[PDB]
Subunit: 123 residues, 4 copies
């Protein structure tokens, strides 16, 4: 359906790079590279998407997770993106995300950042 649509390389407004493969069973697998934060190189990501979306012009729901540990760095944090893929000439993934840091119980109240990223197939 959108499996072909989704699979490939995406960029967000920060210059981060998202490389993903969409499986026929709804799986998402790939790597993420962040242009910001104390992140370097590629980090693993896994997620899911609606492999049988509605056919009424709705987007396709999806989400994925990155834990910010790889062989170079550990930020002791994880981001999840939740959003929808929108096909067409200017195909986009529109997301909102939550970034939770490991914290003490005392600092739990400020453990979580929220934002929005838009991914396109170019730049």
């Amino acid at each position: 359906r959108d499996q072909a649509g989704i699979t490939g390389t995406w960029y967000n407004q920060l210059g981060s790079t998202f490389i993903v493969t969409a499986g026929a069973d709804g799986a998402l697998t790939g790597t993420y590279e962040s242009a910001v934060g104390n992140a370097e190189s590629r980090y693993v990501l896994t997620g899911r998407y609606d492999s049988a979306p509605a056919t009424d012009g709705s987007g396709t729901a999806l989400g994925w997770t990155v834990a910010w540990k790889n062989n170079y760095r550990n930020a002791h944090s994880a981001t999840t993106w939740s959003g929808q893929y929108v096909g067409g000439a200017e195909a986009r993934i529109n997301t909102q995300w939550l970034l939770t840091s490991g914290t003490t119980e005392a600092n739990a109240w400020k453990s979580t950042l929220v934002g929005h990223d838009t991914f396109t197939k170019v730049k």
Copy 2:
């Protein structure tokens, strides 16, 4: 290494059931069963956790995704949970989540729900 800590069955305050295995490499895999919403039986989930957390009493960052499609129902949506695992006699996973529905462009502004779930090892 909260690998043993994380792996197993969890319940949230809504009576939902989260069954997960934590891999040594930081993978999360399993199934989710929602006590509420347009949902029935088990749905696949995947995610990531920090397999080398800080040793200072901080929690362990983690997240995962469910796409609300299985052999019974398709809600045309996906939830991501972002949060942290806290060990100890009453181990908890404390989360915030985003639930995005596939929508038309005109309804995109109301595509996404936000909430918080707390998971424990009993009920």
Copy 3:
């Protein structure tokens, strides 16, 4: 003091209209008109802003609330916008918002929408 800066008429990407006065004490007062949702005409808003922001190029923190009741409609809901004002040739208010509906205890899990609006001084 972005008091001058903030006061006036703003528009977001949905074609909604925000009219606000900033008081020297940090008050925000005005009316909001939503292009979308179960809304008509103007609704009162109130909020606060940092009336003595950092001088280092940072934006100015602010937020406001609208309850979606006026003489025409009642949507039994309230939105808060939280964001920052950024001055300059293309002045912006960048926001994230939570919209909570009054619900039964059984539907509380889906009480709240989350989004992002960007406001500019034209269109």
Copy 4:
């Protein structure tokens, strides 16, 4: 009817103190004292609530803002709480909040925290 219900002193799970008056026109006014963060003493708050709630056992929607500047400190930030007031023997205000810091454009991605507070009439 919740004017009376809402008006008064409230405490959240962090030991913060929220003092509010609900006006008949849907206004909320008062002060907030945070038990955590870079905060001391009282800060002004303003907001709105649905003064004509549904009669079907639904909660009453409301929200309010605090800018974290007073005569003692300036944290260059603002929190909005969005949620609902639930009446009865153990009356609650159940909220989700966004805390936005003033930042440079380069740090704007990490400008906003998200959380949840529950307020009760005791402790």
